[PDB]
Amino acid sequence: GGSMRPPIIIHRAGKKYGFTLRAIRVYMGDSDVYTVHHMVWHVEDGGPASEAGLRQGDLITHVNGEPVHGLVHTEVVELILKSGNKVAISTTPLEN
């Protein structure tokens, strides 16, 4: 199921969306390869993202409907920025 979790439509606040994006990494239990994930580490209290429903410690699987599973921290950052006015952030639990 690709489309199941509702995206967090965050409104533009001048430039920032009111949250901190962090490219976390969990090493794979087999090789030396790692598993990089894009998770929001913090959401400003009363910020746009907070209003949109974005929480910290989730897992951003898609940005604007685009698969970001594999991109660099900046690719997704730009992606979000490129949205314009608002951005749909597909958030899902961070279970590991």
Binding site: T20, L21, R22, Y34, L81, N96
Partner: peptide
């Protein structure tokens, strides 16, 4: 820790 600052990047958007 996965919450490190080493390889774990951080940037406010």
């Amino acid at each position: 820790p996965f919450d490190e600052d080493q390889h774990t990047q951080i940037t406010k958007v």
